[PDB]
Design a protein around this ligand. Sequence first.
Ligand SMILES: COc1ccc(Nc2ncnc(-c3cccnc3Nc3cc(NC(=O)c4cccc(C(F)(F)F)c4)ccc3C)n2)cc1
Ligand SMILES: COc1ccc(Nc2ncnc(-c3cccnc3Nc3cc(NC(=O)c4cccc(C(F)(F)F)c4)ccc3C)n2)cc1
Ligand SMILES: [Ca+2]
Ligand SMILES: [Ca+2]
Ligand SMILES: [Ca+2]
Ligand SMILES: [Ca+2]
Ligand SMILES: [Ca+2]
Lengths: 282, 274
Amino acid sequence: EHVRRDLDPNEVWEIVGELGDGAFGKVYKAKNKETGALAAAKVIEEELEDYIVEIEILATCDHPYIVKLLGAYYHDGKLWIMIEFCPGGAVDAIMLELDRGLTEPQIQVVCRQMLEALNFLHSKRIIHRDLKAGNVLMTLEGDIRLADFGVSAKNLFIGTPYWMAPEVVMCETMKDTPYDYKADIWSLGITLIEMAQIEPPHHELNPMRVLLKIAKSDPPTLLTPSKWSVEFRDFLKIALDKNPETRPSAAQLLEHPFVSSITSNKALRELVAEAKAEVMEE
Amino acid sequence: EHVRRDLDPNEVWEIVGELGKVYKAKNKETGALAAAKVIELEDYIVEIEILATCDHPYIVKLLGAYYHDGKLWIMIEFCPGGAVDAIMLELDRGLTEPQIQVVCRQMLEALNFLHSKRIIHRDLKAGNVLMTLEGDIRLADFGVSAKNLIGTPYWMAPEVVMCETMKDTPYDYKADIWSLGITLIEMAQIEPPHHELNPMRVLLKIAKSDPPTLLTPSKWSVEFRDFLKIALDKNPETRPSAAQLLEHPFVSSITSNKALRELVAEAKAEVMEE
Ligand SMILES: COc1ccc(Nc2ncnc(-c3cccnc3Nc3cc(NC(=O)c4cccc(C(F)(F)F)c4)ccc3C)n2)cc1
Ligand SMILES: COc1ccc(Nc2ncnc(-c3cccnc3Nc3cc(NC(=O)c4cccc(C(F)(F)F)c4)ccc3C)n2)cc1
Ligand SMILES: [Ca+2]
Ligand SMILES: [Ca+2]
Ligand SMILES: [Ca+2]
Ligand SMILES: [Ca+2]
Ligand SMILES: [Ca+2]
């Protein structure tokens, strides 16, 4: 497997803090006794069947911009999942701590590296399905790591076809290639608005009403278009296409001028240095 | 459970024919005939709970379920008329309009029952309509039985919102109303629409084409054609429910199963030929 039962993780890892309490189980800051390496450890009390799925995904997702699995153990009735620690925290928290949105140049770095990560996931037939700023972790170098928390949404014949209703044909066709991946391109567009404006579109509406709103409204656009370049607004226009057939792929959007010339993560390294300096205030 | 482990089914049932495997079975005490599905469990208990809840005149009737000697038994009341699609093959014709009205009436009543219990069939077709010798239907499902009871919303793509909204009330039940409309055409014409296309191309066709209509509209009443027009609405929002369609003049005056009893008598007499 990708899970070790022979080894007790307490022999190798020291729990040195707490991070989150997602309903799944506790999550700790952990320090490696041999190396000093820092990790975030999710510990969960054959219900394991559902949970091994996450580890197989992570194990396949070896890429610079996706969280990096350091290990998985099952020991004394508890499942351990050890990810490399991203000291910068999530982008949404960074915006709360600085009490502002990202500059356009910080959003271009984010966008560029997300597109690269998505191009990788999709070419492996993995769909994220929960993109948002809370799922983008930052390193102190200014690189993202795409993550997923909570009820991890990542993942790889309802009748005889002559009798199938059109809406059932459509919702089955949306579940395989090349339509399924398009959902992430949309959510990416919304994440960019969230990073620009702090809140996603329709944030004022309760969760049930916002579904209606998404289905029936024109695609969202930036609140103050004069703050933003035409490249950003065109990127959104194209990504936030309600039609998944014409919505471009990650590989296509990497050639859009919003991101095609980004060759430096400087702007995002600066953001993380500033967030750290702000956190330090007392 | 709804499954007995105390009782060996061979003590009560005699296998007397073939239809895992599925047998014609005869009750040693009563003489009652049953169709028995025997299987080499989690996936399979779902079917029995559905059947156990679906006590209605026009839905297959569960007589019992046993688990014994590593085998799961599911016993349904035997419907001697067979399935409607097989009847059309044996007679080498479609149903008359009066026979389709009885079928339509009774299917609507069955669907109204299933949907009011939050059960969706999802595989309606003439091959799933069993007939009794009295001329009543029994709605069934065979094969991989299809009967049954995502992200944070601000970031969700419109197509994902739509395909999640189609999975709960009142949109999910609408799929059956469509399939009912296609079943009526299948009974009128023997084959469903687009039967010439391979299964993968037919999906594209269903999504992109206008709704299907009857090949020779002058053979059929305006009530039948209007019923289809209304039931084969591509928009599940405006597609009517089973309860609404029961008030359509195609079926609102049907008070006799005579036409369908005659069909089953004729099919039986045809089968007898040798
Ligand atoms: C309070 O301030 C901080 C500061 C830094 C951090 N840093 C950090 N670094 C790394 N991970 C975490 C983390 C925090 C809370 C919960 N989980 C975390 N990581 C984590 C992620 C996962 N899984 C995934 O991210 C995941 C699962 C399925 C698919 C995918 C993907 F599609 F993206 F590849 C990703 C599994 C186990 C763990 C411990 N947190 C957190 C809070
Ligand atoms: C070859 O000639 C004949 C002539 C008469 C018959 N009659 C007949 N009568 C009753 N059942 C069967 C039958 C034949 C082959 C397979 N299964 C049959 N019935 C059956 C149906 C079920 N389940 C359902 O129909 C079912 C399952 C889930 C949901 C639902 C529904 F949503 F419709 F309620 C229905 C389970 C077990 C069995 C043995 N067959 C069959 C073949
Ligand atoms: Ca690096
Ligand atoms: Ca908020
Ligand atoms: Ca300061
Ligand atoms: Ca055929
Ligand atoms: Ca004859």
